[PDB]
Amino acid sequence: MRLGMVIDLQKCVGCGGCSLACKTENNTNDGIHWSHHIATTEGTFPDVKYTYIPTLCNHCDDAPCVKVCPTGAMHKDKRGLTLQNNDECIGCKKCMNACPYGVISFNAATPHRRWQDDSEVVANGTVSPLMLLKRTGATATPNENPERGDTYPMIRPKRTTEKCTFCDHRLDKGLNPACVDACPSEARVIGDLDDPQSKVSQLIKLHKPMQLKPEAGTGPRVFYIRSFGVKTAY
Amino acid sequence: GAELPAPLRRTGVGEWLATTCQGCTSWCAKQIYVMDGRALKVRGNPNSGVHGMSSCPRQHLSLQQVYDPDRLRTPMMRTNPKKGRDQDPKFVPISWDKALDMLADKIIALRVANEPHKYALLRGRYSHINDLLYKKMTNLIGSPNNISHSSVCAEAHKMGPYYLDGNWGYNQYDVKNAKFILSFGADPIASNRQVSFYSQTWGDSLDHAKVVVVDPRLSASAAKAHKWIPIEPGQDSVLALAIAHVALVEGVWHKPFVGDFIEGKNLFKAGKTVSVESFKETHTYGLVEWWNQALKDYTPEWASKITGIDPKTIIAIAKDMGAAAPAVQVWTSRGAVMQARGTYTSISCHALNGLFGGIDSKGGLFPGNKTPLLKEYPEAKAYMDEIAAKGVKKEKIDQRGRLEFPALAKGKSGGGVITANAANGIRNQDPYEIKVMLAYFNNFNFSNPEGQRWDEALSKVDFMAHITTNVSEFSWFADVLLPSSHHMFEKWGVLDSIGNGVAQISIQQPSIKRLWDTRIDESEIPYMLAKKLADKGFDAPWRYINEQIVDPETGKPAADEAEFAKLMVRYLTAPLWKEDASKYGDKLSSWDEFVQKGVWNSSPYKLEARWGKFKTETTKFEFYSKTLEKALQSHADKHKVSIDEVMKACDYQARGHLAFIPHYEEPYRFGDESEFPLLLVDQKSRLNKEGRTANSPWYYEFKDVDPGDVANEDVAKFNPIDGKKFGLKDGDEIRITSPVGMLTCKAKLWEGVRPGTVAKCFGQGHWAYGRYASAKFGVTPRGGSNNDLIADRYDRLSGASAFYGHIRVRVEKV
Ligand SMILES: Nc1nc2c(c(=O)[nH]1)N[C@H]1C(S)=C(S)[C@@H](COP(=O)(O)OP(=O)(O)OC[C@H]3O[C@@H](n4cnc5c(=O)[nH]c(N)nc54)[C@H](O)[C@@H]3O)O[C@H]1N2
Ligand SMILES: Nc1nc2c(c(=O)[nH]1)N[C@H]1C(S)=C(S)[C@@H](COP(=O)(O)OP(=O)(O)OC[C@H]3O[C@@H](n4cnc5c(=O)[nH]c(N)nc54)[C@H](O)[C@@H]3O)O[C@H]1N2
Ligand code: SF4
Ligand code: SF4
Ligand code: SF4
Ligand code: SF4
Ligand code: SF4
Ligand SMILES: [Mo]
């Protein structure tokens, strides 16, 4: 089994809804976005092209992040996912240097520290981050998703790395990744690339698949098909 | 950190509760996922026939609005009697009873002094239960000054649809079946009125639709289009008119809709008049007169001289649209039409929807489907006392209907609101002083052009109360703050949406326990105020509510605030769930089923439904708008002048027949071009939930999803040509100055900007709202406030405020 994702760039509108859904699903600290993007503007006015490429962990066939991890925290599971036992992460950052894609973040900052602020912009009138935390019963942020804790820390400790887990906790329940469900055009499809009848396997036969940095030799399993833009008419 | 055993796992087991998002007037039906009493996720309501589970990205930002750490948790009163940008209100907490006591005393004092018309109700956003607070309460008090925000929104965009085909309203666009899409400034995968549905369909449609996007900036939509036309701001109608000209010369109008020459031969020859009797129109009126009076001379060469567009491109577009007809749809955005002469851009662009037959056709555009949703509570005439009956006849504070403010909504002189001009009436006490103001869900100091006029106006209002979740810029001038329960998570409401060939009606319902000591703006607050007014001897509102707004099943009035909140929605939606709505769409068996599904869908639109029966003077699609002539004649007769004198007084170039046909108005411009060499291209952020996500950190984290923009910054985008001219580099702190104001932000050089323009998102520049939205709350803004640059100007025929085309600016490094 080799789970992967096919992203249809023609359907993609570059809105970031996938990345925002990932924020709500996975309780990433402010500034940490497991789902992100690469956008490019090419050409000189008036012949200007803008492209947006959604990015995430490519859950690589030959993941260098796994190979360099000195503790075995970073590992492959039987679905082909690259997952992390965060409890064994010593924050050495070797995975980040090994990953060609820059999709791993390091929790140098205490996650959700801004929610410890109890100052009020209007005293005894407006509330505060800390007061909202108390009111809602949340631990770190009122937006924290407890589901995440099924398989991974809801709130990661400082001095550990983290990245896209392919919403493994949702897959375990037979559900879709949050970013897949969040996409208005259904541009994102996941499945088993080892199953020739899976939608993803058929998509990369119907369309020419493209990968990010295949030259790095990791065998990424996020495939991009079609074109964000179209050739200019007239 | 072991994985949890299956019986203790939590993924997927929480509850989804239906509501409606209002980040834009897409008004998408949603479900909220709730676990441990907290809202954790938002998704499109799968039952929605307009958009299904599809959503734009802003649905997720909703979660940082309800859980905004700068929300008000209590009513407050200011303790500084002075008001102003420089005056700290020194708000102190008070009770709801005391806050409403203060407001009630001020309202009653007006009535005792026989000046109830000096009360004003200001409405920003709203739901369809607004009639009570907005209209009924206001009129029962005795005021005509229920002032919506519509004219700072898009009223100019309704002029074409109304005066050509009788639709004072918006259209849905049949993208799934379109063969040609021409967008004058619309960016439907980022803004406009079904971002979820048009994002769902846009990329797929490129395989069967040729898409041209006309916008001074390379928008997301233009980036996914076959042609980006980087129009000079304010020149859109030039292209629309030249396309129509070529369509006639080439003989490729849509004959089943328009008609044809009686003898078959195409007699439209460039520059030369045609006999009206030689053409037989089918469902249109005025084609030959339009040609003879103007269109015969709107050649591709004429258009190329003005716009720089290659005439071969104009010609090819016209022919492509002819071949695609009637699967042709022309969009207009605020950018094209919210200009001082923009009524005729709406008309000129929308005329193409008639000429190519797209109006009410497959692949074209058409109005929202009929639904049985009620939009008003019962008549209140029997509850109007003599004080109120006299007061409601006073001239409105926004001066609508004066010679220079025809505001011809639905064909009526003074028919339309003039939101931005209410500040001018207030600050000039013309027609009279406003002494008591209640405002909700609005921030006109920030959202209206030259909003410092609202600073001035509100500082002159004896008593104002603001119904709001956050202390925004408008709130700074309030005597009393009335904190609102959040519309999307803590409120009973009802909204609608159109798209995908259907109209839907969706519920808003509380999905969490109310966080703070807030009340629902449109139901609980007017209910509580009516009780307070009755306690103080003015019980007409209370009697009206208790006798007219009663449960549709039990006939009983609400027992308390919370029951009333739901009752307001039950009352208006009863035609959907108490009655059989099968004739219009879904059959719902009960209120509970309506709440559980969360949405009612109409049947699919019947194509060509309106052909031959438009609500125009002629019942035709009017290229020569006898409908607009009648409205202008009414306004002219009211003011004892000619129509031409109205045009002159309203600063349009049109004279004679040109007042009634698609024609070229040179765009109004303000300021010396040599001092102010750049034209502002105001745009929305695709992460703006109107003016309401600037206090959401995720907004900034992903701000570069706006093409050309920069995460965690407020940038103005310049073409590199102008960057070199003005010595600007990426990241430079800059000041942009217009004749009326200035802002500071950062510079970004981007080739997707037309040279001579500067493209900058509206949405930042808050100095209040919250700690993330401002640098120093109450004092120093984050980013730059676009509307401080935009001179207070109007499309006087519609009442619309102008936000585009006329704004000249200069730039310098700070
Ligand atoms: N993301 C987001 N979407 C929204 C909203 C929001 O706040 N955020 N608000 C909703 C509401 S209330 C409204 S009324 C609608 C408005 O939706 P629309 O009427 O479609 O237009 P705007 O979103 O206001 O965008 C203005 C666009 O016009 C462009 N433009 C500016 N000047 C000119 C010009 O002279 N000519 C031409 N051709 N284009 C010009 C700008 O570049 C910009 O792309 O959007 C709704 N959709
Ligand atoms: N330069 C520029 N100006 C614009 C636009 C643009 O594109 N460019 N867009 C214009 C358009 S199309 C519109 S329609 C207008 C809208 O303009 P406004 O109607 O003034 O809307 P907002 O700016 O969103 O302010 C709404 C305010 O309600 C408060 N509030 C926030 N959330 C809630 C809630 O849940 N309940 C209640 N009771 N109050 C709440 C806050 O005070 C908030 O500032 O802005 C417009 N101004
Ligand atoms: S949600 Fe879908 S359309 Fe939006 S950026 Fe992500 S992949 Fe693209
Ligand atoms: S994308 Fe990077 S983090 Fe993800 S599996 Fe590949 S090497 Fe590892
Ligand atoms: S930072 Fe953690 S996951 Fe990465 S290599 Fe070091 S121990 Fe392994
Ligand atoms: S698969 Fe899940 S973890 Fe990965 S980017 Fe999508 S939402 Fe984030
Ligand atoms: S912000 Fe507008 S388009 Fe986006 S989900 Fe909300 S209502 Fe729909
Ligand atoms: Mo609007």
JSON list of C-alpha atoms in Angstrom, two decimals, chain A residues 9-17 19-21 23-25 29-33 35-37 41 43-46 48-50 52 87 114-115 117-129 131-132 135-138 141-151 169-170 172-173 175 181-185 226-234, chain B residues 1-4 8-13 33 35-36 38 40-41 53-55 57 60-61 63-64 67-74 76 91 93 180 189 196 199-200 203-204 206-207 210 212 218 223-228 230 313 316-317 320 471 513-516 686-687 697-698 701-702 704-705 707-708 719 750-755 770-772 777:
[
{"chain": "A", "resi": 9, "resn": "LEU", "atom": "CA", "xyz": [-4.17, 22.24, -10.89]},
{"chain": "A", "resi": 10, "resn": "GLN", "atom": "CA", "xyz": [-6.88, 23.12, -13.41]},
{"chain": "A", "resi": 11, "resn": "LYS", "atom": "CA", "xyz": [-9.51, 22.69, -10.71]},
{"chain": "A", "resi": 12, "resn": "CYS", "atom": "CA", "xyz": [-7.39, 24.46, -8.09]},
{"chain": "A", "resi": 13, "resn": "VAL", "atom": "CA", "xyz": [-8.22, 28.14, -7.59]},
{"chain": "A", "resi": 14, "resn": "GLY", "atom": "CA", "xyz": [-5.31, 28.90, -5.24]},
{"chain": "A", "resi": 15, "resn": "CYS", "atom": "CA", "xyz": [-7.56, 29.87, -2.32]},
{"chain": "A", "resi": 16, "resn": "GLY", "atom": "CA", "xyz": [-5.70, 28.24, 0.58]},
{"chain": "A", "resi": 17, "resn": "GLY", "atom": "CA", "xyz": [-8.84, 26.55, 1.90]},
{"chain": "A", "resi": 19, "resn": "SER", "atom": "CA", "xyz": [-4.23, 24.99, 4.29]},
{"chain": "A", "resi": 20, "resn": "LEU", "atom": "CA", "xyz": [-6.78, 26.69, 6.54]},
{"chain": "A", "resi": 21, "resn": "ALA", "atom": "CA", "xyz": [-8.61, 23.39, 7.00]},
{"chain": "A", "resi": 23, "resn": "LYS", "atom": "CA", "xyz": [-4.93, 24.57, 10.67]},
{"chain": "A", "resi": 24, "resn": "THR", "atom": "CA", "xyz": [-8.33, 23.72, 12.16]},
{"chain": "A", "resi": 25, "resn": "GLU", "atom": "CA", "xyz": [-7.72, 19.98, 11.97]},
{"chain": "A", "resi": 29, "resn": "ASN", "atom": "CA", "xyz": [0.88, 26.84, 16.11]},
{"chain": "A", "resi": 30, "resn": "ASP", "atom": "CA", "xyz": [0.53, 30.27, 14.62]},
{"chain": "A", "resi": 31, "resn": "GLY", "atom": "CA", "xyz": [2.92, 30.46, 11.68]},
{"chain": "A", "resi": 32, "resn": "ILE", "atom": "CA", "xyz": [3.14, 26.67, 11.25]},
{"chain": "A", "resi": 33, "resn": "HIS", "atom": "CA", "xyz": [1.24, 25.40, 8.22]},
{"chain": "A", "resi": 35, "resn": "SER", "atom": "CA", "xyz": [-0.35, 22.45, 4.14]},
{"chain": "A", "resi": 36, "resn": "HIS", "atom": "CA", "xyz": [1.08, 25.44, 2.32]},
{"chain": "A", "resi": 37, "resn": "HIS", "atom": "CA", "xyz": [1.80, 26.46, -1.26]},
{"chain": "A", "resi": 41, "resn": "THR", "atom": "CA", "xyz": [4.36, 35.03, -11.10]},
{"chain": "A", "resi": 43, "resn": "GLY", "atom": "CA", "xyz": [6.36, 37.28, -17.38]},
{"chain": "A", "resi": 44, "resn": "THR", "atom": "CA", "xyz": [6.34, 41.01, -17.99]},
{"chain": "A", "resi": 45, "resn": "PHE", "atom": "CA", "xyz": [3.17, 43.06, -18.25]},
{"chain": "A", "resi": 46, "resn": "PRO", "atom": "CA", "xyz": [0.83, 42.43, -19.99]},
{"chain": "A", "resi": 48, "resn": "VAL", "atom": "CA", "xyz": [1.76, 37.72, -16.92]},
{"chain": "A", "resi": 49, "resn": "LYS", "atom": "CA", "xyz": [1.15, 34.21, -15.58]},
{"chain": "A", "resi": 50, "resn": "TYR", "atom": "CA", "xyz": [0.28, 33.43, -11.97]},
{"chain": "A", "resi": 52, "resn": "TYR", "atom": "CA", "xyz": [-0.42, 28.37, -7.25]},
{"chain": "A", "resi": 87, "resn": "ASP", "atom": "CA", "xyz": [7.32, 11.40, 22.08]},
{"chain": "A", "resi": 114, "resn": "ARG", "atom": "CA", "xyz": [-0.41, 34.10, 22.41]},
{"chain": "A", "resi": 115, "resn": "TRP", "atom": "CA", "xyz": [-3.42, 32.56, 24.20]},
{"chain": "A", "resi": 117, "resn": "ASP", "atom": "CA", "xyz": [-2.20, 36.93, 27.16]},
{"chain": "A", "resi": 118, "resn": "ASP", "atom": "CA", "xyz": [-4.80, 38.22, 29.63]},
{"chain": "A", "resi": 119, "resn": "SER", "atom": "CA", "xyz": [-4.71, 41.86, 28.55]},
{"chain": "A", "resi": 120, "resn": "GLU", "atom": "CA", "xyz": [-7.98, 43.41, 27.39]},
{"chain": "A", "resi": 121, "resn": "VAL", "atom": "CA", "xyz": [-8.22, 46.07, 24.70]},
{"chain": "A", "resi": 122, "resn": "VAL", "atom": "CA", "xyz": [-11.14, 47.58, 26.66]},
{"chain": "A", "resi": 123, "resn": "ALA", "atom": "CA", "xyz": [-10.69, 46.79, 30.34]},
{"chain": "A", "resi": 124, "resn": "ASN", "atom": "CA", "xyz": [-13.55, 44.82, 31.88]},
{"chain": "A", "resi": 125, "resn": "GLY", "atom": "CA", "xyz": [-15.34, 45.21, 28.56]},
{"chain": "A", "resi": 126, "resn": "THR", "atom": "CA", "xyz": [-13.71, 43.08, 25.91]},
{"chain": "A", "resi": 127, "resn": "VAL", "atom": "CA", "xyz": [-12.29, 39.70, 26.81]},
{"chain": "A", "resi": 128, "resn": "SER", "atom": "CA", "xyz": [-8.78, 38.31, 26.48]},
{"chain": "A", "resi": 129, "resn": "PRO", "atom": "CA", "xyz": [-7.10, 35.24, 25.00]},
{"chain": "A", "resi": 131, "resn": "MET", "atom": "CA", "xyz": [-10.22, 34.46, 29.46]},
{"chain": "A", "resi": 132, "resn": "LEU", "atom": "CA", "xyz": [-11.54, 32.88, 26.28]},
{"chain": "A", "resi": 135, "resn": "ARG", "atom": "CA", "xyz": [-14.47, 30.17, 29.23]},
{"chain": "A", "resi": 136, "resn": "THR", "atom": "CA", "xyz": [-14.31, 27.47, 26.57]},
{"chain": "A", "resi": 137, "resn": "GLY", "atom": "CA", "xyz": [-12.48, 24.84, 28.62]},
{"chain": "A", "resi": 138, "resn": "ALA", "atom": "CA", "xyz": [-9.71, 24.55, 26.04]},
{"chain": "A", "resi": 141, "resn": "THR", "atom": "CA", "xyz": [-6.39, 27.47, 22.15]},
{"chain": "A", "resi": 142, "resn": "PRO", "atom": "CA", "xyz": [-10.19, 27.61, 21.84]},
{"chain": "A", "resi": 143, "resn": "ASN", "atom": "CA", "xyz": [-9.67, 26.34, 18.29]},
{"chain": "A", "resi": 144, "resn": "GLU", "atom": "CA", "xyz": [-7.91, 23.12, 19.31]},
{"chain": "A", "resi": 145, "resn": "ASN", "atom": "CA", "xyz": [-9.26, 19.92, 17.77]},
{"chain": "A", "resi": 146, "resn": "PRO", "atom": "CA", "xyz": [-9.32, 17.03, 20.28]},
{"chain": "A", "resi": 147, "resn": "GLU", "atom": "CA", "xyz": [-9.63, 14.48, 17.46]},
{"chain": "A", "resi": 148, "resn": "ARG", "atom": "CA", "xyz": [-5.97, 15.07, 16.64]},
{"chain": "A", "resi": 149, "resn": "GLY", "atom": "CA", "xyz": [-4.99, 13.35, 19.89]},
{"chain": "A", "resi": 150, "resn": "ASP", "atom": "CA", "xyz": [-6.23, 10.00, 18.60]},
{"chain": "A", "resi": 151, "resn": "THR", "atom": "CA", "xyz": [-2.81, 9.34, 17.10]},
{"chain": "A", "resi": 169, "resn": "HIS", "atom": "CA", "xyz": [-6.30, 9.91, 12.40]},
{"chain": "A", "resi": 170, "resn": "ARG", "atom": "CA", "xyz": [-9.10, 10.55, 9.90]},
{"chain": "A", "resi": 172, "resn": "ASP", "atom": "CA", "xyz": [-8.12, 5.44, 10.68]},
{"chain": "A", "resi": 173, "resn": "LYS", "atom": "CA", "xyz": [-11.84, 6.28, 10.94]},
{"chain": "A", "resi": 175, "resn": "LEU", "atom": "CA", "xyz": [-12.70, 9.54, 6.67]},
{"chain": "A", "resi": 181, "resn": "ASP", "atom": "CA", "xyz": [-12.90, 17.66, 2.17]},
{"chain": "A", "resi": 182, "resn": "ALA", "atom": "CA", "xyz": [-12.17, 21.40, 2.25]},
{"chain": "A", "resi": 183, "resn": "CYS", "atom": "CA", "xyz": [-11.44, 21.79, -1.47]},
{"chain": "A", "resi": 184, "resn": "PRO", "atom": "CA", "xyz": [-14.36, 23.46, -3.27]},
{"chain": "A", "resi": 185, "resn": "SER", "atom": "CA", "xyz": [-13.48, 21.96, -6.66]},
{"chain": "A", "resi": 226, "resn": "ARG", "atom": "CA", "xyz": [-3.05, 19.55, -15.64]},
{"chain": "A", "resi": 227, "resn": "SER", "atom": "CA", "xyz": [-2.39, 23.29, -15.60]},
{"chain": "A", "resi": 228, "resn": "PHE", "atom": "CA", "xyz": [-3.38, 26.08, -13.24]},
{"chain": "A", "resi": 229, "resn": "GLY", "atom": "CA", "xyz": [-3.56, 28.50, -16.16]},
{"chain": "A", "resi": 230, "resn": "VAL", "atom": "CA", "xyz": [-4.42, 28.29, -19.82]},
{"chain": "A", "resi": 231, "resn": "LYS", "atom": "CA", "xyz": [-2.58, 29.58, -22.85]},
{"chain": "A", "resi": 232, "resn": "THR", "atom": "CA", "xyz": [-3.60, 33.11, -23.74]},
{"chain": "A", "resi": 233, "resn": "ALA", "atom": "CA", "xyz": [-6.01, 33.43, -26.64]},
{"chain": "A", "resi": 234, "resn": "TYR", "atom": "CA", "xyz": [-6.09, 36.30, -29.13]},
{"chain": "B", "resi": 1, "resn": "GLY", "atom": "CA", "xyz": [1.41, 9.47, 23.39]},
{"chain": "B", "resi": 2, "resn": "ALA", "atom": "CA", "xyz": [0.23, 5.99, 22.51]},
{"chain": "B", "resi": 3, "resn": "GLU", "atom": "CA", "xyz": [-2.54, 5.90, 19.94]},
{"chain": "B", "resi": 4, "resn": "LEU", "atom": "CA", "xyz": [-5.90, 5.80, 21.66]},
{"chain": "B", "resi": 8, "resn": "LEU", "atom": "CA", "xyz": [-11.81, 6.15, 23.21]},
{"chain": "B", "resi": 9, "resn": "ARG", "atom": "CA", "xyz": [-11.02, 7.65, 19.83]},
{"chain": "B", "resi": 10, "resn": "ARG", "atom": "CA", "xyz": [-12.76, 10.90, 19.04]},
{"chain": "B", "resi": 11, "resn": "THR", "atom": "CA", "xyz": [-12.25, 11.46, 15.31]},
{"chain": "B", "resi": 12, "resn": "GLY", "atom": "CA", "xyz": [-15.55, 11.90, 13.50]},
{"chain": "B", "resi": 13, "resn": "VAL", "atom": "CA", "xyz": [-17.93, 11.49, 16.44]},
{"chain": "B", "resi": 33, "resn": "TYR", "atom": "CA", "xyz": [-18.67, 20.70, 13.94]},
{"chain": "B", "resi": 35, "resn": "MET", "atom": "CA", "xyz": [-17.02, 18.78, 20.29]},
{"chain": "B", "resi": 36, "resn": "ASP", "atom": "CA", "xyz": [-16.62, 19.53, 24.00]},
{"chain": "B", "resi": 38, "resn": "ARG", "atom": "CA", "xyz": [-16.60, 24.17, 21.05]},
{"chain": "B", "resi": 40, "resn": "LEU", "atom": "CA", "xyz": [-14.00, 23.20, 15.68]},
{"chain": "B", "resi": 41, "resn": "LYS", "atom": "CA", "xyz": [-14.72, 23.08, 11.96]},
{"chain": "B", "resi": 53, "resn": "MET", "atom": "CA", "xyz": [-20.06, 20.95, 0.48]},
{"chain": "B", "resi": 54, "resn": "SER", "atom": "CA", "xyz": [-17.99, 23.36, -1.65]},
{"chain": "B", "resi": 55, "resn": "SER", "atom": "CA", "xyz": [-16.65, 26.36, 0.26]},
{"chain": "B", "resi": 57, "resn": "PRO", "atom": "CA", "xyz": [-11.39, 29.44, 2.30]},
{"chain": "B", "resi": 60, "resn": "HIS", "atom": "CA", "xyz": [-12.39, 28.49, 8.50]},
{"chain": "B", "resi": 61, "resn": "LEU", "atom": "CA", "xyz": [-11.68, 32.05, 9.61]},
{"chain": "B", "resi": 63, "resn": "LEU", "atom": "CA", "xyz": [-13.69, 30.15, 14.05]},
{"chain": "B", "resi": 64, "resn": "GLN", "atom": "CA", "xyz": [-11.36, 33.04, 14.91]},
{"chain": "B", "resi": 67, "resn": "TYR", "atom": "CA", "xyz": [-13.47, 32.92, 19.46]},
{"chain": "B", "resi": 68, "resn": "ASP", "atom": "CA", "xyz": [-12.06, 36.40, 18.91]},
{"chain": "B", "resi": 69, "resn": "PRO", "atom": "CA", "xyz": [-10.34, 37.40, 22.19]},
{"chain": "B", "resi": 70, "resn": "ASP", "atom": "CA", "xyz": [-11.34, 41.05, 21.66]},
{"chain": "B", "resi": 71, "resn": "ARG", "atom": "CA", "xyz": [-15.09, 40.48, 21.60]},
{"chain": "B", "resi": 72, "resn": "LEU", "atom": "CA", "xyz": [-17.22, 42.50, 23.98]},
{"chain": "B", "resi": 73, "resn": "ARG", "atom": "CA", "xyz": [-18.66, 40.46, 26.84]},
{"chain": "B", "resi": 74, "resn": "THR", "atom": "CA", "xyz": [-20.86, 43.18, 28.37]},
{"chain": "B", "resi": 76, "resn": "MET", "atom": "CA", "xyz": [-20.76, 49.44, 28.07]},
{"chain": "B", "resi": 91, "resn": "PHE", "atom": "CA", "xyz": [-15.89, 52.69, 28.24]},
{"chain": "B", "resi": 93, "resn": "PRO", "atom": "CA", "xyz": [-19.22, 48.01, 31.81]},
{"chain": "B", "resi": 180, "resn": "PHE", "atom": "CA", "xyz": [-18.14, 32.38, -23.29]},
{"chain": "B", "resi": 189, "resn": "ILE", "atom": "CA", "xyz": [-13.23, 32.41, -7.48]},
{"chain": "B", "resi": 196, "resn": "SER", "atom": "CA", "xyz": [-17.99, 28.49, -3.10]},
{"chain": "B", "resi": 199, "resn": "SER", "atom": "CA", "xyz": [-14.72, 28.08, -7.23]},
{"chain": "B", "resi": 200, "resn": "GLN", "atom": "CA", "xyz": [-16.24, 24.60, -7.53]},
{"chain": "B", "resi": 203, "resn": "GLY", "atom": "CA", "xyz": [-11.55, 25.29, -13.61]},
{"chain": "B", "resi": 204, "resn": "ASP", "atom": "CA", "xyz": [-13.84, 22.63, -15.05]},
{"chain": "B", "resi": 206, "resn": "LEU", "atom": "CA", "xyz": [-12.41, 26.23, -18.97]},
{"chain": "B", "resi": 207, "resn": "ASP", "atom": "CA", "xyz": [-12.75, 23.10, -21.08]},
{"chain": "B", "resi": 210, "resn": "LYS", "atom": "CA", "xyz": [-13.63, 30.79, -23.35]},
{"chain": "B", "resi": 212, "resn": "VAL", "atom": "CA", "xyz": [-11.92, 36.83, -20.72]},
{"chain": "B", "resi": 218, "resn": "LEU", "atom": "CA", "xyz": [-4.27, 40.13, -12.70]},
{"chain": "B", "resi": 223, "resn": "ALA", "atom": "CA", "xyz": [-4.89, 34.12, -13.93]},
{"chain": "B", "resi": 224, "resn": "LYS", "atom": "CA", "xyz": [-7.22, 31.19, -14.75]},
{"chain": "B", "resi": 225, "resn": "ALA", "atom": "CA", "xyz": [-8.66, 32.81, -17.87]},
{"chain": "B", "resi": 226, "resn": "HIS", "atom": "CA", "xyz": [-7.89, 32.66, -21.58]},
{"chain": "B", "resi": 227, "resn": "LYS", "atom": "CA", "xyz": [-7.37, 36.42, -21.72]},
{"chain": "B", "resi": 228, "resn": "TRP", "atom": "CA", "xyz": [-6.57, 39.08, -19.16]},
{"chain": "B", "resi": 230, "resn": "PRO", "atom": "CA", "xyz": [-5.71, 45.01, -18.06]},
{"chain": "B", "resi": 313, "resn": "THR", "atom": "CA", "xyz": [-9.00, 41.33, -30.13]},
{"chain": "B", "resi": 316, "resn": "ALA", "atom": "CA", "xyz": [-12.37, 38.28, -32.19]},
{"chain": "B", "resi": 317, "resn": "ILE", "atom": "CA", "xyz": [-14.14, 38.50, -28.81]},
{"chain": "B", "resi": 320, "resn": "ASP", "atom": "CA", "xyz": [-16.50, 34.33, -30.33]},
{"chain": "B", "resi": 471, "resn": "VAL", "atom": "CA", "xyz": [-15.21, 47.61, 19.43]},
{"chain": "B", "resi": 513, "resn": "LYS", "atom": "CA", "xyz": [-23.59, 27.85, 24.35]},
{"chain": "B", "resi": 514, "resn": "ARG", "atom": "CA", "xyz": [-23.54, 31.64, 24.30]},
{"chain": "B", "resi": 515, "resn": "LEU", "atom": "CA", "xyz": [-20.04, 32.71, 25.30]},
{"chain": "B", "resi": 516, "resn": "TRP", "atom": "CA", "xyz": [-20.66, 36.09, 26.93]},
{"chain": "B", "resi": 686, "resn": "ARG", "atom": "CA", "xyz": [-10.15, 36.75, -0.81]},
{"chain": "B", "resi": 687, "resn": "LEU", "atom": "CA", "xyz": [-9.75, 36.28, 2.94]},
{"chain": "B", "resi": 697, "resn": "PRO", "atom": "CA", "xyz": [-4.39, 35.79, 12.80]},
{"chain": "B", "resi": 698, "resn": "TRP", "atom": "CA", "xyz": [-4.99, 33.11, 10.14]},
{"chain": "B", "resi": 701, "resn": "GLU", "atom": "CA", "xyz": [-0.81, 33.90, 7.93]},
{"chain": "B", "resi": 702, "resn": "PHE", "atom": "CA", "xyz": [-2.28, 33.15, 4.49]},
{"chain": "B", "resi": 704, "resn": "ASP", "atom": "CA", "xyz": [-0.56, 35.87, 0.02]},
{"chain": "B", "resi": 705, "resn": "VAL", "atom": "CA", "xyz": [-3.37, 33.70, -1.36]},
{"chain": "B", "resi": 707, "resn": "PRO", "atom": "CA", "xyz": [-2.22, 37.00, -6.01]},
{"chain": "B", "resi": 708, "resn": "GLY", "atom": "CA", "xyz": [0.72, 39.35, -5.66]},
{"chain": "B", "resi": 719, "resn": "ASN", "atom": "CA", "xyz": [4.02, 47.56, -11.75]},
{"chain": "B", "resi": 750, "resn": "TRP", "atom": "CA", "xyz": [4.21, 42.97, -9.32]},
{"chain": "B", "resi": 751, "resn": "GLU", "atom": "CA", "xyz": [3.89, 42.62, -13.07]},
{"chain": "B", "resi": 752, "resn": "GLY", "atom": "CA", "xyz": [0.17, 41.79, -12.71]},
{"chain": "B", "resi": 753, "resn": "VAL", "atom": "CA", "xyz": [-0.50, 45.51, -12.09]},
{"chain": "B", "resi": 754, "resn": "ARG", "atom": "CA", "xyz": [-1.40, 47.75, -15.00]},
{"chain": "B", "resi": 755, "resn": "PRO", "atom": "CA", "xyz": [1.23, 50.52, -15.24]},
{"chain": "B", "resi": 770, "resn": "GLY", "atom": "CA", "xyz": [-8.92, 44.20, 18.17]},
{"chain": "B", "resi": 771, "resn": "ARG", "atom": "CA", "xyz": [-5.31, 43.61, 19.06]},
{"chain": "B", "resi": 772, "resn": "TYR", "atom": "CA", "xyz": [-4.42, 41.71, 15.89]},
{"chain": "B", "resi": 777, "resn": "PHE", "atom": "CA", "xyz": [-5.81, 49.64, 19.76]}
]
